[PDB]
Amino acid sequence: MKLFKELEETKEQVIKMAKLVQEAIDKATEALNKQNVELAEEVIKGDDTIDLLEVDIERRCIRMIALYQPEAGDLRMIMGIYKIVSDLERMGDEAENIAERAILLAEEPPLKPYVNINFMSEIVKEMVNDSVISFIQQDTLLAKKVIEKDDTVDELYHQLERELMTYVLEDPRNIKRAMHLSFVARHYERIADHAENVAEAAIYLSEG
């Protein structure tokens, strides 16, 4: 009885953790776009908080278990949350890194608008959001359509990857920037794989 309160905020902690990750990406992409160290500097010192939300939720879970010991579909949610919460941390971590490489791309002009990375990022934020609200609220049709999304991201990557190899196949100087940029794109694909893990874990835990 005393335990529902505990669990219901814990779920909202995860939801909050996810808005912060989404906003990291959002900042990270912007800082990369309108080239802006002062913004990536925000992203980087931002992880601090996400690392702590991770810690917190972990620490919340262990209390819920030792205090109450759940069973059946409840212990299954806590253990599952304990799990999806480090996926969330990694995601926000990738973000940290996107910001890292944005700092380095400030070291010279744009070789390209940065088109692709955006469409990716845009989609990616949508994934984070849902992959969680699919876990927490066990909507299988949502989780399934998130899983389906990761492959539009994939396109964009193995698509950019080919445009990014124009610039080297046509100019020596270039390499330095396109280099950082590849890294940057793989980060966004990672963020999706992460989220689609969470969507799998959801589909998993769910029909239990």
Curated annotation (Swiss-Prot):
This is Phosphate-specific transport system accessory protein PhoU homolog. Pfam families: PhoU. GO terms for biological process: intracellular phosphate ion homeostasis; negative regulation of gene expression; negative regulation of phosphate metabolic process; negative regulation of phosphate transmembrane transport; phosphate ion transport. Belongs to the PhoU family. SUPFAM superfamilies: PhoU-like (SSF109755). It is found in: Cytoplasm. InterPro entries: P_transport_PhoU, PhoU-like_sf, PhoU_dom. It comes from Aquifex aeolicus (strain VF5). Its main location: cytoplasm. Gene3D superfamilies: Phosphate transport system protein phou homolog 2, domain 2. Homodimer.
